[PDB]
Amino acid sequence: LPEPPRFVETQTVKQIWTSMRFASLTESIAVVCGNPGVGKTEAAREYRRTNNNVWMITITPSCASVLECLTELAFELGMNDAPRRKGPLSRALRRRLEGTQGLVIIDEADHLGAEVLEELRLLQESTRIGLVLMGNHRVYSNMTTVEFARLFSRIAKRTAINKTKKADVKAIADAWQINGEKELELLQQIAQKPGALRILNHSLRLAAMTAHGKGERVNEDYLRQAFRELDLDVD
Amino acid sequence: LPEPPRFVETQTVKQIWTSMRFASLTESIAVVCGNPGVGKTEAAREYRRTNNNVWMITITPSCASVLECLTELAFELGMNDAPRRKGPLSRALRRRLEGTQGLVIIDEADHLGAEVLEELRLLQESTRIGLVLMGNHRVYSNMTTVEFARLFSRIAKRTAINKTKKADVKAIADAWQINGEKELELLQQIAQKPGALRILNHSLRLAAMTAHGKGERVNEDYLRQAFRELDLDVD
Amino acid sequence: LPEPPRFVETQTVKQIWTSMRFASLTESIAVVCGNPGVGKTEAAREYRRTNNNVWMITITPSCASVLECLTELAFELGMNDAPRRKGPLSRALRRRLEGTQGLVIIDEADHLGAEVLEELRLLQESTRIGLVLMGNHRVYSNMTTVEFARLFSRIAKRTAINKTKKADVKAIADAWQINGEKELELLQQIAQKPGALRILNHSLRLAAMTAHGKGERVNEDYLRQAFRELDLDVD
Amino acid sequence: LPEPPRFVETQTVKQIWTSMRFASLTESIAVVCGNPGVGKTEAAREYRRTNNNVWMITITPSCASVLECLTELAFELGMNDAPRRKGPLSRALRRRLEGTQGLVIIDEADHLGAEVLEELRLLQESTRIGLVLMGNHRVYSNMTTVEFARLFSRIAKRTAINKTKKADVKAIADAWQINGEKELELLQQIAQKPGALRILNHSLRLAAMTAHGKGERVNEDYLRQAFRELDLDVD
Numbered sequence: 001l002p003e004p005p006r007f008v009e010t011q012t013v014k015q016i017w018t019s020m021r022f023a024s025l026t027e028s029i030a031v032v033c034g035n036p037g038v039g040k041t042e043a044a045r046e047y048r049r050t051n052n053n054v055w056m057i058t059i060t061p062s063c064a065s066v067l068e069c070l071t072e073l074a075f076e077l078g079m080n081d082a083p084r085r086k087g088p089l090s091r092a093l094r095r096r097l098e099g100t101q102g103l104v105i106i107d108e109a110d111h112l113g114a115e116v117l118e119e120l121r122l123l124q125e126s127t128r129i130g131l132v133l134m135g136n137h138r139v140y141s142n143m144t145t146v147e148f149a150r151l152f153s154r155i156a157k158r159t160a161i162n163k164t165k166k167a168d169v170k171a172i173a174d175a176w177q178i179n180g181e182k183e184l185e186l187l188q189q190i191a192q193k194p195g196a197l198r199i200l201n202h203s204l205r206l207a208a209m210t211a212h213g214k215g216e217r218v219n220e221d222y223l224r225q226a227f228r229e230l231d232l233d234v235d
Numbered sequence: 236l237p238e239p240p241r242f243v244e245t246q247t248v249k250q251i252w253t254s255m256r257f258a259s260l261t262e263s264i265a266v267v268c269g270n271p272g273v274g275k276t277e278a279a280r281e282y283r284r285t286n287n288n289v290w291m292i293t294i295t296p297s298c299a300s301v302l303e304c305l306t307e308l309a310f311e312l313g314m315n316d317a318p319r320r321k322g323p324l325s326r327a328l329r330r331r332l333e334g335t336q337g338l339v340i341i342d343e344a345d346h347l348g349a350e351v352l353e354e355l356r357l358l359q360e361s362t363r364i365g366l367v368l369m370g371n372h373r374v375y376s377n378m379t380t381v382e383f384a385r386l387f388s389r390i391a392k393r394t395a396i397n398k399t400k401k402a403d404v405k406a407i408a409d410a411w412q413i414n415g416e417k418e419l420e421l422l423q424q425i426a427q428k429p430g431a432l433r434i435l436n437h438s439l440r441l442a443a444m445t446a447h448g449k450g451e452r453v454n455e456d457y458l459r460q461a462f463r464e465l466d467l468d469v470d
Numbered sequence: 471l472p473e474p475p476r477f478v479e480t481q482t483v484k485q486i487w488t489s490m491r492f493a494s495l496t497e498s499i500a501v502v503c504g505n506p507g508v509g510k511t512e513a514a515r516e517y518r519r520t521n522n523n524v525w526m527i528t529i530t531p532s533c534a535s536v537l538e539c540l541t542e543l544a545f546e547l548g549m550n551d552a553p554r555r556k557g558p559l560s561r562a563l564r565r566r567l568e569g570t571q572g573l574v575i576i577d578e579a580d581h582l583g584a585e586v587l588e589e590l591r592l593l594q595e596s597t598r599i600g601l602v603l604m605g606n607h608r609v610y611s612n613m614t615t616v617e618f619a620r621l622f623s624r625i626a627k628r629t630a631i632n633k634t635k636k637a638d639v640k641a642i643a644d645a646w647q648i649n650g651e652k653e654l655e656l657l658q659q660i661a662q663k664p665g666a667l668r669i670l671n672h673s674l675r676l677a678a679m680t681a682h683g684k685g686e687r688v689n690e691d692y693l694r695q696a697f698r699e700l701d702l703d704v705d
Numbered sequence: 706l707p708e709p710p711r712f713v714e715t716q717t718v719k720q721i722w723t724s725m726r727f728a729s730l731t732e733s734i735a736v737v738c739g740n741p742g743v744g745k746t747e748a749a750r751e752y753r754r755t756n757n758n759v760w761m762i763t764i765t766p767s768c769a770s771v772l773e774c775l776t777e778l779a780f781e782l783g784m785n786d787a788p789r790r791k792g793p794l795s796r797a798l799r800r801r802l803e804g805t806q807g808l809v810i811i812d813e814a815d816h817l818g819a820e821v822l823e824e825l826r827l828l829q830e831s832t833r834i835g836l837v838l839m840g841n842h843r844v845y846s847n848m849t850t851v852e853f854a855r856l857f858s859r860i861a862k863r864t865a866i867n868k869t870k871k872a873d874v875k876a877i878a879d880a881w882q883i884n885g886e887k888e889l890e891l892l893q894q895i896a897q898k899p900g901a902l903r904i905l906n907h908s909l910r911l912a913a914m915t916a917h918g919k920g921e922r923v924n925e926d927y928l929r930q931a932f933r934e935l936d937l938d939v940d
């Protein structure tokens with residue numbers, strides 16, 4: 001019956017915002033490698049929505065060149081007059097982006113070319129801004145250090161989020177007005193399976209729409225039917 | 236609680252500024268080869284901010300041609316009407332840059348092509364200006380002298396900065412208002428590990444943000460937790 | 471303490487042998503598509519060991535041509551003088567294999583080329599022998615019928631084995647001298663997870679070697695530690 | 706003064722032999738991913754020296770094809786008449802190796818091609834033998850499962866050895882006749898640094914040769930000078 005809230009502040013959200021503002025004021029590189037679906041991508045957008053001098057792209061592996069990725073960052077900076085060459089684009093980024101005290105956020109940092117991440121790190125370095133890397137744990141695996149040596153020299157704050165915590169789903173249940181202890185344990189058990197935030201949010205939205213269609217309150221059995229869907233135990 | 240200082244004058248900063256002004260008034264070549272993250276890059280920018288007729292580029296290995304690097308120096312000179320050919324660009328640099336009594340600073344001089352550094356040395360020579368090389372100790376290793384013979388004849392003041400000194404981190408503690416002798420020894424021990432200035436700055440900024448978030452003073456335990464992060468003993 | 475038995479007769483083994491002898495006497499094609507690790511590959515070898523005029527290859531996708539696969543069947547027939555051309559090999563198979571009333575078994579029938587399975591079906595047809603296909607459920611998916619039309623007309627007895635049964639693991643516990651009902655339920659729960667026969671056999675062999683190294687009987691806790699290994703809930 | 710012993714039974718050696726004999730009797734695949742220099746390679750050779758029906762290759766990335774690697778295994782089987790084609794070699798391995806109840810050991814399993822490890826797993830499977838994979842933790846990273854899906858279904862006993870234990874270096878000190886508790890703590894501290902078994906063995910051999918050249922007993926100061934060598938804190 002109430003409106004579903006899309007985003008909730010969580011222990012991971014608190015942690016990752018402190019890491020984000022750390023790389024902001026620190027003006028240095030923060031790598032966030034974690035399990036898939038730990039909710040990192042969404043929080044970054046909440047940081048972008050709440051804070052000034054913040055930018056974010058995503059990297060599809062289609063846009064995984066230096067040219068394409070810097071073009072993406074340039075259009076995110078609003079310079080629609082960006083040149084299609086590498087060089088003058090790099091110069092335009094260097095003139096535009098330095099002195100703003102900003103924070104660049106990059107998602108899926110595993111698909112970075114060495115020249116790609118190289119130009120990014122030398123950019124923020126030659127720009128006095130923030131760069132923050134996201135994605136899975138292949139990002140730190142791509143460094144483990146003569147090709148990534150000076151880059152490993154400046155990793156300010158890595159923060160690994162493997163899975164959720166109990167206060168994480170507890171604040172989730174607080175935001176979704178969930179009071180059952182059986183409900184809380186079931187939410188925790190759902191959080192034990194991967195795609196944690198995504199599956200939990202899906203399960204929450206299935207139960208909310210089912211209880212709204214039946215005119216009832218979200219309860220434990222709606223959550224059981226929701227989790228009984230999705231083919232999680234079906235190969 | 237106070238504002239963090241962005242830059243601190245240091246014994247290396249004193250040394251390297253004297254080398255920088257030496258190559259300036261001397262109008263000759265100074266190679267600064269050191270360990271990675273000795274803080275040389277940052278000081279160069281303080282020299283650029285404090286002094287007139289000073290320019291600086293960075294060299295990504297993307298921009299490692301003669302054409303690209305001279306284009307970078309040209310846009311740093313503000314000649315946005317620079318030609319995309321090598322020749323007329325070299326002529327425009329020769330007319331623009333001679334007679335100003337300036338100082339060109341070049342970072343990461345290890346990725347120089349022989350024609351690249353060749354055109355740079357013949358430039359400053361035919362320009363009555365200063366050139367200063369930065370980077371790791373591969374720059375002097377690329378010369379050790381019939382291809383680099385007259386260039387090794389040019390060299391005015393090499394200054395090797397391997398690691399920090401104790402007065403270095405002492406002036407750091409003076410700038411960061413640090414009075415603990417246990418704190419001073421811990422800062423020195425952090426300076427013994429590579430990425431010296433970078434890790435120390437990271438550690439200083441971690442402790443400052445943690446003590447500001449907890450409302451307290453930066454103390455030894457915040458420094459221990461900061462250094463306990465970053466995976467320095469983790470492979 | 472007793473000798474571990476490598477193979478046990480099972481409800482799937484009974485079913486699949488009846489399908490195998492059916493395609494034998496019927497001299498027609500039987501496709502066995504199932505989930506991975508349903509134990510089909512091993513049983514086929516028990517059929518090969520117990521029965522005369524039985525042959526079996528495996529198909530690695532390295533050997534997935536008509537030439538390579540028929541060469542494999544030829545060396546399985548013991549004709550080491552087989553020609554390296556397609557044609558005379560096909561003739562040698564046609565002369566050797568017809569009149570023996572045999573049964574060809576082919577594993578991993580999903581990696582069949584259309585010409586590959588085409589030559590196989592026209593072989594057995596022009597040979598008065600048996601062909602039996604194995605593998606996952608992509609084999610029937612590759613037919614779902616103008617390129618596979620007459621082949622879908624040959625189909626004699628498909629038998630899909632998705633997962634195990636309770637009498638399956640019951641005869642497993644009879645062969646492994648397992649009498650605990652808690653043990654039986656735990657074996658069933660292990661059979662609910664994929665790689666059923668393989669994981670169960672691994673678990674049985676872990677518990678047997680652990681109880682033999684500790685001088686004890688296989689019990690429930692050894693099975694729990696065995697299943698606690700293998701990273702089944704670890705991504 | 707006594708003879709140095711090269712190999713000592715250790716907790717990792719006990720663990721890894723139990724995993725090795727497990728994959729032997731189990732006739733299934735055991736992946737041993739660990740940190741570099743955890744001493745796994747040597748123990749494998751002790752298993753090869755002590756046990757019958759055991760074979761081992763190494764994989765240089767020069768020999769990283771299916772053809773080259775199977776050729777290596779064939780020459781390890783003593784069939785010097787092995788064919789230089791893939792197919793008849795695979796057939797010769799299939800006829801030679803099945804029925805012996807053997808154990809193949811493969812080192813550096815990270816450099817496996819998909820067809821390479823594919824032919825190996827289908828080999829042991831079509832051979833009723835043992836395969837055991839070694840190397841760093843990139844082997845399990847290359848699987849994390851539709852290209853490696855049935856292979857991840859094969860996996861019997863992974864054993865990760867990150868670093869040593871205290872009983873490990875304790876049995877080392879027992880084999881090397883080391884009784885000092887200061888000596889024991891120093892050996893443990895050396896074991897905390899990577900290249901554990903190798904550096905410790907190097908340190909042991911430096912101290913043994915120095916004390917033999919000086920006519921004395923190995924003591925703590927010889928160990929300190931040995932560890933003071935090797936440039937472990939020098940970049």
Ligand SMILES: Nc1ncnc2c1ncn2[C@@H]1O[C@H](COP(=O)(O)OP(=O)(O)O)[C@@H](O)[C@H]1O
Nearest residue numbers: 006007008036037038039040041042197198201
């Ligand atoms: N605080 C939150 N509240 C609700 N859903 C969240 C929250 N944080 C993340 N999510 C969910 O996580 C997903 C977005 O991030 P996600 O895709 O998990 O990132 P990544 O795949 O990079 O780990 C969506 O399902 C989103 O609803």
Ligand SMILES: Nc1ncnc2c1ncn2[C@@H]1O[C@H](COP(=O)(O)OP(=O)(O)O)[C@@H](O)[C@H]1O
Nearest residue numbers: 241242243271272273274275276277432433436
């Ligand atoms: N005087 C200084 N005060 C504060 N930080 C400094 C100072 N000198 C260097 N740094 C730090 O060093 C880095 C910039 O130079 P650096 O990257 O170490 O140069 P290089 O890699 O070429 O040796 C940044 O982390 C910067 O904060």
Ligand SMILES: Nc1ncnc2c1ncn2[C@@H]1O[C@H](COP(=O)(O)OP(=O)(O)O)[C@@H](O)[C@H]1O
Nearest residue numbers: 476477478506507508509510511512667668671
């Ligand atoms: N009757 C049986 N008794 C014991 N183990 C069996 C039995 N049948 C199959 N297995 C096990 O199953 C595997 C053989 O079949 P498998 O290769 O899994 O078939 P597929 O992967 O083609 O479905 C081996 O692990 C083997 O030990």
Ligand SMILES: Nc1ncnc2c1ncn2[C@@H]1O[C@H](COP(=O)(O)OP(=O)(O)O)[C@@H](O)[C@H]1O
Nearest residue numbers: 711712713741742743744745746747902903906
């Ligand atoms: N039991 C042991 N006692 C002494 N040294 C050992 C022992 N086991 C292994 N080593 C040492 O380990 C090395 C051989 O294995 P290693 O190179 O560490 O394997 P990997 O590189 O695959 O981890 C040699 O330095 C060898 O002396």
